[PDB]
Amino acid sequence: LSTMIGKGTGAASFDEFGNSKYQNRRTMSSSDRAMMNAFKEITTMADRINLPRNIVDRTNNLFKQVYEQKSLKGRANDAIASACLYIACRQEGVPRTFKEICAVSRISKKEIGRCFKLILKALETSVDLITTGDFMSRFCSNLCLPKQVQMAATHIARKAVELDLVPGRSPISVAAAAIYMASQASAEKRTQKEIGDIAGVADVTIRQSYRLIYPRAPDLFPTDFKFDTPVDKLPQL
């Protein structure tokens, strides 16, 4: 805890030539100074994607433990913060994709993942596996899809995983394909490029995942779904 000297008022406060004789001194500890900078970076990343403050608070707590544990001392602080931010989103039940975290961070996706693994090891903690429904609300909302389409996409992805029609596929790829299937079955139709941009998945990956679930399209769709485009006439590709 410290006090900062205020600005000079009278002539006595100023040296013989202009500059104030009493100047603030950097007395902050190096460990605290780096930690302070990390929290500033954490807040900056969160605002880019409008993360709630509670997630930021969890992220700040995670970094302090990681920073104190010093298992990741060799890695850049920004990467740790970016990885810590990713873990906080998972811990709070609103996971963000590594690409989404990278979009708001100068650190690349690969480094974030590497730090993410180390932080879990250092903290002796675990994160629940991501499901296709963990991204439907954000992906559909960003695509400006109605609630009915979002519900259909959520049901399609959940049913497809349960039916094991996309074994080994990344949950994001399955969700993007499910959104595309639901989007093409409603008035609001979105292209693969459109869904890929928000979902962060290449249109080719959406095409592959969609092709796997297309054969059983009627089964995956909700029973009480109003098909603007009939399931039979859904795109085949």
């Binding site: 996706k109 690969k110 928000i198």
Partner: protein
């Protein structure tokens, strides 16, 4: 359309590619470095270590080790202490 998910930033892959393409500086033989080191001294009487590395294009540790044997550090209060390429 802002902060779209991306695996790696475009500015970052270009920098990574340039670093990979350029490659790490190699440790050349002492004689060649010495010959190039003294040729540089001809152009300018005084050289900065950071700028001197670019001319030699040698690892900093290797350059310092060779420069330490013959080169000496002269303390200048105006800016900072720099290296002297004159053996004496």
């Amino acid at each position: 359309t802002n902060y779209k998910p991306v695996a790696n930033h475009q500015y970052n892959i270009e920098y990574e590619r340039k670093k990979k393409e350029d490659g790490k500086r190699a440790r050349a033989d002492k004689q060649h470095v010495l010959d190039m080191l003294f040729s540089a001294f001809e152009k300018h009487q005084y050289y900065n270590l950071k700028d001197l590395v670019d001319i030699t294009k040698q690892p900093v540790v290797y350059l310092k080790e060779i420069l330490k044997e013959i080169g000496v550090q002269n303390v200048k209060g105006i800016h900072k202490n720099t290296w002297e390429l004159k053996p004496e």
